[PDB]
Structures are given as C-alpha cells and as structure tokens.
Design an enzyme around this catalytic site. Structure first.
Site, PDB file in Angstrom:
ATOM      1  N   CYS A 243       0.593  -0.035   0.191  1.00 42.87           N
ATOM      2  CA  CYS A 243       0.943  -0.744   1.421  1.00 42.87           C
ATOM      3  C   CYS A 243       0.211  -0.149   2.618  1.00 42.87           C
ATOM      4  O   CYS A 243       0.424   1.021   2.967  1.00 42.87           O
ATOM      5  CB  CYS A 243       2.460  -0.702   1.666  1.00 42.87           C
ATOM      6  SG  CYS A 243       2.942  -1.540   3.191  1.00 42.87           S
TER       7      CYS A 243
ATOM      8  N   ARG B 166       2.470   0.899   6.360  1.00 42.98           N
ATOM      9  CA  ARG B 166       3.540   1.892   6.335  1.00 42.98           C
ATOM     10  C   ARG B 166       3.745   2.673   7.631  1.00 42.98           C
ATOM     11  O   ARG B 166       4.713   3.436   7.699  1.00 42.98           O
ATOM     12  CB  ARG B 166       3.304   2.885   5.202  1.00 42.98           C
ATOM     13  CG  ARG B 166       3.725   2.341   3.849  1.00 42.98           C
ATOM     14  CD  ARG B 166       3.398   3.359   2.773  1.00 42.98           C
ATOM     15  NE  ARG B 166       1.959   3.424   2.480  1.00 42.98           N
ATOM     16  CZ  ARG B 166       1.389   4.428   1.821  1.00 42.98           C
ATOM     17  NH1 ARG B 166       2.137   5.455   1.421  1.00 42.98           N
ATOM     18  NH2 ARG B 166       0.078   4.411   1.560  1.00 42.98           N
TER      19      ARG B 166
ATOM     20  N   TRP C  14       5.214  -8.687   8.137  1.00 48.53           N
ATOM     21  CA  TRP C  14       4.367  -9.697   8.743  1.00 48.53           C
ATOM     22  C   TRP C  14       2.989  -9.582   8.116  1.00 48.53           C
ATOM     23  O   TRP C  14       2.648  -8.570   7.509  1.00 48.53           O
ATOM     24  CB  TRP C  14       4.301  -9.545  10.272  1.00 48.53           C
ATOM     25  CG  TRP C  14       3.932  -8.169  10.759  1.00 48.53           C
ATOM     26  CD1 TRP C  14       2.678  -7.624  10.806  1.00 48.53           C
ATOM     27  CD2 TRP C  14       4.820  -7.171  11.277  1.00 48.53           C
ATOM     28  NE1 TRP C  14       2.731  -6.351  11.324  1.00 48.53           N
ATOM     29  CE2 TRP C  14       4.038  -6.050  11.621  1.00 48.53           C
ATOM     30  CE3 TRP C  14       6.203  -7.118  11.487  1.00 48.53           C
ATOM     31  CZ2 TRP C  14       4.591  -4.888  12.158  1.00 48.53           C
ATOM     32  CZ3 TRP C  14       6.751  -5.960  12.022  1.00 48.53           C
ATOM     33  CH2 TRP C  14       5.947  -4.864  12.355  1.00 48.53           C
TER      34      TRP C  14
ATOM     35  N   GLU D  43      -4.862 -11.471   4.038  1.00 53.77           N
ATOM     36  CA  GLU D  43      -4.038 -11.946   2.928  1.00 53.77           C
ATOM     37  C   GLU D  43      -4.104 -13.463   2.809  1.00 53.77           C
ATOM     38  O   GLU D  43      -4.256 -13.997   1.702  1.00 53.77           O
ATOM     39  CB  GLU D  43      -2.587 -11.503   3.108  1.00 53.77           C
ATOM     40  CG  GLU D  43      -2.403  -9.985   3.163  1.00 53.77           C
ATOM     41  CD  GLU D  43      -0.935  -9.598   3.353  1.00 53.77           C
ATOM     42  OE1 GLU D  43      -0.177  -9.662   2.356  1.00 53.77           O
ATOM     43  OE2 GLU D  43      -0.557  -9.247   4.495  1.00 53.77           O
TER      44      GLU D  43
END
Ligand code: HEM
Ligand code: HEM
Ligand SMILES: CNCc1cc(Cl)cc(-c2cc(C)cc(N)n2)c1
Ligand SMILES: CNCc1cc(Cl)cc(-c2cc(C)cc(N)n2)c1
Ligand SMILES: C[C@H](O)[C@H](O)[C@H]1CNc2nc(N)[nH]c(=O)c2N1
Ligand SMILES: C[C@H](O)[C@H](O)[C@H]1CNc2nc(N)[nH]c(=O)c2N1
Ligand SMILES: [Zn+2]
Lengths: 414, 418
Positions: B116, B119, B288, B293
C-alpha cells in the site's frame, strides 16, 4: 520439485524446474525479500576451483550431448591436472564461446536475451598490454557498430590470476560522455560520469569541455597503471535527436551514441574470473529517452522540453512530466530509425522477451528474470512483462558486478 | 541490521524492524519470489478451529504487542487480560478483542501492508465495529453506513467495517464482491465483453441469483452478502450513495463523448484481517483513489475496459507501429482527464507524483520511529512513468508483520449451498 509462474493477463502458467540448478545467493532470506536492492549479498583456492570447474565442464558436455563421453572424461582429467600443477586452468575456445553466451542467457536483469545465441565472441586472452587492449576494443567497436546495423559482441581479456595482475577497462561503458562540475554548482555534460572524467583529466586528458564529449578509454593490463587512449572519432556513431512533429526539438542540441557497450562487469565461467569483458548490443529507446535524458541525476531535460511544449508546470496533476517524457521518447526512436541505427522500442522488446521466456521454460525448464529490471521505466503496465510473474535465481556462467578499479588499485608511478 | 539506499538522494536507512517478521515471504537465499502475486501459504494458525496450544501463543503475542505499544507491558491490566483470554479460549476455543485492541489491530494491519502506497495516513482510520451483526440485512445496513460516511459528499474519509470473526469456518461472514462498488461485465453473443471483463463471473453469479441486469457498460453491481455461513443475499446499493465522476478532458472536448465514468470510492471487501490469531473474513475497507488505478489499470489493461484504441483514434495518432508510442501518448491523456475530472467535481484523488513523494516521507518517518517499513517495490511503483517517481529509485525491504491483511479464497469456490 516444481514452481509455477502465472501471467495474469493471459492466464498462461509455466513450470520452473531450472531453479533447482541454482548456485549462488539471491540476497533474500526466508523471512525478508531484497528483490529491489541494487547490489545485494582474494581469489579462489585450489580446493574451491575443482568443483566449480567440474560443474562447468559437466554442463558444457551435457549441452553438446557428450556427457560421459571419452572426451568429457579426458577434459575433466586435463582440467584437474592444470589446477593441480598451476592453481588455475585455461578454457578451450569452444568452452569460452559457450560460457560467454550462457552468461548472457543467464542475465536475469536483461530484457534482450531472445538474442543470446547470436553473440560474436572475440578471444583476447593473448593480450598483454594496454595498447593491445585498445586495438581489441577498436576492432570490437567497428565490428559491432557495422555502419548502424548493430551486431552483438563481447571481447574477453585474460582471466584473473592472483588478483594483483587484473585486466580492467576503467570506463563503465566503452562510449560515454564526459561530465564537468562547474564552479557555480551546475554540471556540463553527463553528471553520472563526473568522477571518471576527473580521473581522466588527472591522467593527462585535455577535455573539450562540451556537453557531449566522448570520453577516452582508460585501460589497465596485467595489474599495471591504466593508460589513456582516444577512440578514433570515425568509429563513434552518433544520432542527432529530432522530433517528427516539433521542429524546435532539434534546437535542444541533443544527441546520443549508437552503441551501448558495458565494460565494467566481471564474467565468471567455471570458477574463472574475466575482469575485463566489454560487451555490446543495441539500445532499447527508454534507456536513452527515460533514464539518460530524464533522470534528475542525468541530463535532466524534462523542464526544458515541457517549457517548449507550453505545458502547465504549476502542478504535478497536470502530468506535464509524463507528457514531455513520452515526446522525448518518440524523438529518440524516430531519430535512430531515420538514421537506420538499430534500436528497439519498449513495446517490441518486452513482447519478444515474453516469447523468449516461454521458449526457455519449454526447452530449458525456466528463465531467471528480475521483474524490477525487466519492466521498462515508463508505461509499465501496458507492456506484457508487467503482468508476467517471474522467478529470480542465479545460474552460472554469470555476469557480476565488481568494485570500481580506482577504489582498489594501488598505483606505481613516481 | 540491513540497509536500504535511495539512488537519487543517496539517503541510506537502517532496518531493524524486520527482526519481528512472522511469516515466510516465499523467497529463499537461492530463489526470489518478489514478483509472485501469492508467493506463500504460510499461515499463523491452521485451517480451522485451533487447539489451545495453537491459538493461545498467537493471542499472547498480540496482547503483548498491544500492551507494549501503550507502555503497559506486565501491568496489572496486561496480566489480567492474558488470564481472561486464557479462560475464553478454554471455554469457547476463541476469544474476543476489546474495542481498543480491535482499533489498534486494524490500524496496524494497514500500517503493515507492504503493497500500500497510501500508508502515510495509517493512523487516520475510522473503525466501525460490526461484530454484533447476525444477518445479511444487518450487513447491508453496516455497509451502507460505511459507504455514506467514507464518501462524505466527495471529501473521502478512510474507514473499515469489521464483521464477526471466523469461528469454525462453517459460519463465515463474507462479502462476495471483491469491492463494494464495481461495474458489471457481460459476455456478448459474438464473443466480445460489455462492461468490466474482470467481473464477468461475479456478474453471472448475481444474474443466476435473480439480479436483473440493465446490461450497460457501467452497471453498478449489487451487493452479495453472506452472514453466519448462510447462502448469500442480493442487495441494491441506493444509487444516491454511489458517487460517480463523468470523465472529461481539459483540452479535448471530444473526450466526454467517449461516455466514460468511474466511481469515487475504492472499497476492498474480499480480504481477511488477521489479529492475534483471529480471522475477520469480512472487513471492507476504503480510502481514496490514486489516479493511475483508474486511468492506467482499470481503463487501459487489455483485459479490462481496454480503451487505448478508441482514445488514440480520436487523437489521430499513428497506430501503425508500436514505435510511434501511440499507446503511451493516449495513456497520458487518459490519466490527465481522470485527475481533472475528479478534481473538478471535488472528489478526493491523488496523483502518482504526490502519492509516491508522500510514501518516501512515510518510509523515512517509519525508519526514524519504528526502525523499518516493509514495502513491496513491485506494487509501490506506479504502473506508468515509473522512473520519474521517487519510489522507483528507492530500495525497499519486504517482510511480513502481524496484524495484517491477507488474501482468502473466493467464497464461490468453497461455499456448499443450502
Ligand atoms: C542485443 C540487444 C540487447 C538489448 C536490447 C538489451 C537490453 C538491456 C536493457 C534495457 C538492460 C537494462 C539496462 C539498464 O537499465 O541499465 C540490460 C541489462 C543487461 N544486459 Fe542486456 N541487452 C542487449 C544485449 C546484451 C548483451 C549482448 C549482453 C552480454 C553479452 C547483455 C548483458 C546484460 C546484462 C548482464 C545486463 C544487466 C546488468 C546488471 O545486472 O546490472 N545484454 N539489457
Ligand atoms: C487513504 C488512501 C489510500 C490510497 C491512496 C491507497 C493506495 C493504494 C494503492 C494504489 C494500492 C495498489 C492497489 C492495486 O494496485 O490493486 C493499494 C493497496 C493496498 N491498500 Fe492502500 N490505499 C489507501 C488506503 C488504504 C486503507 C484505508 C487500507 C486498509 C485499512 C489499505 C490497505 C491496502 C492493502 C492491504 C493493499 C494491498 C491489496 C492487495 O494486496 O491486493 N489502503 N493501496
Ligand atoms: C541503460 N543504459 C546504460 C546501461 C547499463 C547496463 Cl547495466 C546495461 C546496458 C545495456 C547493455 C547492453 C549490452 C545493451 C543495452 N541495450 N543496454 C546499458
Ligand atoms: C486498483 N484498483 C482496485 C483496487 C484493488 C486493490 Cl487490491 C486495492 C485498491 C485500493 C484500496 C484502497 C483502500 C484504496 C485505493 N486507492 N485502492 C484498489
Ligand atoms: C531501487 C531500484 O532497485 C533501482 O532504482 C532499479 C529499479 N529498476 C531498474 N531497472 C533497470 N532496467 N535499470 C535500473 O537501473 C533500475 N534501477
Ligand atoms: C506479476 C506482477 O507481480 C503483477 O502483474 C503485479 C505487478 N505490480 C502490481 N502493482 C500494483 N499496485 N497492482 C498490481 O495489481 C500489480 N500487479
Ligand atoms: Zn525476494
């Protein structure tokens, strides 16, 4: 045992058995992965050399379908005699060619390996002086450049003996541009080569002090102090960079050299270490257009190109860097193709690598591959390698890193 | 100790946190599996209801970690808590987390998520305790409240909703959707696909369960919710809770005619949250988007919406050969449009330049206060323009800390219907 790798785009699944042949370490442990570490993890004794040589001689005779043959057993005996009497041994020409091709075949970070079996091997193990090295390298450059129809090649100088008599090419590539630090903190030319440029100047090179000065060769034979040589300029093929749509691109004054020729790595074959083994292929466009031109630490041209494109540079989310990056890489490919100098774009190169990888799995049982290096530095997921699972492991013969020679050489003059 | 170097800045960080790693990565000193999606099946407790000597060590480890985190190791409350967990396991074969421990565990599962890039936000997570839920109807209520809270009229807020933990493995709570909001995909008569090809199988399950598909290109899928191991049930998310962004371009007025849109809330709902040996099989979490992506993977993957062809045509690019880089050129324009559209509608989004810069800052913070930050280079580097982001030049170490988020099998591969 077997290990499976899947392609998440095509759902093709491949089965790796070759990893069971792995020899040296990856750098990872069972509880930590170090796959993004650039450089993870004096000379071999008689006892260490025997099993390494046997392993290589065994694999060579297996590849030529002569394993267990009378010639195989006599070669092992001969190799064992030499180690016993001389603490080293000498490769046959056939074994040297086989070894150099398989070191390329085994280079997990190389996307161009579909070409591995088409490698011209120049045996320079009779070389004794830096002048001799210069001659061999000039012939290599001329052969490989081939007026723009580039041909892969390697030149192999004498192997390490006691570590006190190494042959070394001090350049990191045969052809690179100088970098010059200015009093005001700016850099002229290639910032990556500032330190090596300083070494050359100290050794007596009189630099032109321009943006694209081809560096001299700094060649070390037999552990002696390295010596300077100028590559004949007619052997250095360069491409002026222009853009098919932006007439102003040529006004940036950019150019690059056609021949990528790595000269600082070490070639290990059957326990023998060839510390000078420059090799060359042809460029993938992103090497020049993304890294050489747009790394903040390199020529760093994004801002100037984006300015001339009238892009909005006030905010990152306009993606002005991304937009300029693409146009720079269009120009690199257009320029090389226009001048009929071999180059490959990252889409074609990664497609061929997937074909190569699948072929290697079928005929060899695997293909060690370093995803972190294989995926191109732009447009990653629109290339097929992004979606390809890969296994990384170290096979020998291999190309390896070695310390820069200025950090270990003990000088002799005055 | 192990060192990581940034090759742009020459910053070197020294990792000691990896000494606390608990599970195998899949790598060995002879093989690296860093680009394998699921390299390891190493689990901390076996397949289902552990015996006492299998569960208690894991519980003690987590309670130890939590009471250490608040400077109360060996305190009165720590030792009572151990005795309490011991009795619960003795009498029920499991134990129940306190609310504080649940919140600590979920935030640290996010903090430990090496894949991720978001973070830096890990400690700003709203945790909704849904462990009193008993039916799929109650799950729907909890999920609707989560979506409305997290969406917040476009000012998105990170959140996780945690349903009852696994007991024997026959009473699992599951959200069968992979994300709370996704678009349907339909196999067309001729062989093509309408909508999102990734969701064709899930869409078919929904249709087979009674869903009446509008059969368009962006049909929000129903929720398919499983409570206490029973057969899953379909629910339509109220459309006013589903925030969507029509995609337009700041320069190309024809871009809007492409008819593209996307939803604002990315909400992963198929992962498993593991805390102290307890497995929370339904734990939808949301944050969000990073623009790539949508603009790179959702829109331009060949096996997703695959729009590069269309966009490049309207740009009048040379699509004859790869070396014109028409794919790369269209890709940039699509990602410009996505960001411009979300920002125009005041829907939270981060670009890959800002996100990766933030993550480098987060790494430095974590090395300074925690002695390390596990990070998966393969996932952290964005899928376009890699080397012009700082994470490309950043060496990373990857290792597995607990609490954690884990993958789990798709429930239709394991559910015996009633
Ligand atoms: C024929 C065309 C070739 C192409 C298109 C090609 C492409 C590439 C590229 C793009 C890289 C990454 C370079 C970087 O990012 O710095 C690379 C690395 C490498 N290439 Fe190839 N290459 C070719 C030929 C060769 C040859 C002929 C050899 C050796 C005989 C070779 C050996 C290597 C090695 C060892 C590496 C990785 C070095 C390391 O581990 O740092 N390549 N190649
Ligand atoms: C707050 C804004 C956030 C941003 C910008 C962000 C960004 C990202 C991105 C870009 C990915 C890669 C996704 C993919 O390629 O499929 C990812 C993965 C992940 N995120 Fe975050 N994230 C955010 C919040 C969160 C939260 C709130 C959680 C959990 C509480 C979380 C847990 C994870 C996990 C576990 C993964 C790995 C998923 C997998 O392995 O399949 N993230 N994140
Ligand atoms: C990335 N530019 C510098 C650089 C670094 C390295 Cl380690 C390898 C190559 C390389 C080597 C060969 C034989 C072909 C090719 N296309 N690139 C180039
Ligand atoms: C990649 N798009 C689909 C997808 C897959 C996965 Cl595995 C995670 C996320 C994700 C999750 C969260 C909480 C925030 C964010 N920005 N993305 C999105
Ligand atoms: C830290 C990271 O490993 C490093 O920046 C790598 C990433 N991938 C790369 N890939 C290639 N081809 N060349 C490189 O120099 C690098 N650098
Ligand atoms: C095979 C490879 O690991 C796989 O395609 C990965 C690469 N990196 C990724 N990175 C992110 N963020 N998301 C992904 O889905 C993937 N896919
Ligand atoms: Zn690894």
């Amino acid at each position: 045992r077997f290990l499976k790798v899947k392609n998440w785009e095509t759902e093709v699944v491949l089965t790796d058995t070759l990893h069971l042949k792995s020899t040296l370490e990856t750098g990872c442990t069972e509880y930590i992965c170090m796959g993004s570490i650039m450089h993870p993890s004096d000379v071999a004794t008689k006892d260490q050399l025997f099993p390494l040589a046997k392993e290589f001689i065994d694999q060579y005779y297996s590849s030529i379908k002569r394993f267990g043959s009378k010639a195989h057993m006599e070669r092992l005996e001969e190799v064992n005699k030499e180690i016993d009497t001389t603490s080293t041994y000498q490769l046959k020409d056939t074994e040297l060619i086989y070894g150099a091709k398989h070191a390329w075949r085994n280079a997990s970070r190389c996307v161009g390996r579909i070409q591995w079996s088409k490698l011209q091997v120049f045996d320079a193990r009779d070389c004794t002086t830096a002048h001799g090295m210069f001659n061999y390298i000039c012939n290599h450059v001329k052969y490989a450049t081939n007026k723009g129809n580039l041909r892969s090649a390697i030149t192999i100088f004498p192997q390490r003996t006691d570590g006190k008599h190494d042959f070394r090419v001090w350049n990191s590539q045969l052809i690179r541009y100088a970098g010059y630090k200015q009093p005001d903190g700016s850099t002229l030319g290639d910032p990556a080569n500032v330190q090596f440029t300083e070494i050359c100047i100290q050794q007596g090179w009189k630099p032109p002090r321009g943006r694209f000065d081809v560096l001299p060769l700094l060649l070390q034979a037999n552990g002696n102090d390295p010596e300077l040589f100028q590559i004949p300029p007619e052997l250095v093929l360069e491409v002026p960079i222009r853009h098919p749509k932006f007439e102003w691109f040529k006004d940036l004054g950019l150019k690059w050299y056609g021949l990528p020729a790595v000269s600082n790595m070490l070639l290990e074959i059957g326990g023998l270490e060839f510390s000078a083994c420059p090799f060359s292929g042809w460029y993938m466009g992103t090497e020049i257009g993304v890294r050489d031109y747009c790394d903040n630490s390199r020529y760093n041209i994004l801002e100037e190109v984006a300015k001339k494109m009238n892009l909005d540079m006030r905010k990152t989310s306009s993606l002005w860097k991304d937009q300029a990056l693409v146009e720079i890489n269009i120009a690199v490919l257009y320029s090389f193709q226009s001048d009929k100098v071999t180059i490959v774009d990252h889409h074609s190169a990664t497609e061929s690598f997937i074909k190569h990888m699948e072929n290697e799995y079928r005929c060899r049982g695997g293909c060690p591959a370093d995803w972190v290096w294989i995926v191109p530095p732009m447009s990653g997921s629109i290339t097929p390698v992004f979606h390809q699972e890969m296994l990384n492991y170290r096979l020998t013969p291999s190309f390896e890193y070695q310390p820069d020679p200025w950090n270990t050489h003990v000088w002799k003059l005055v």
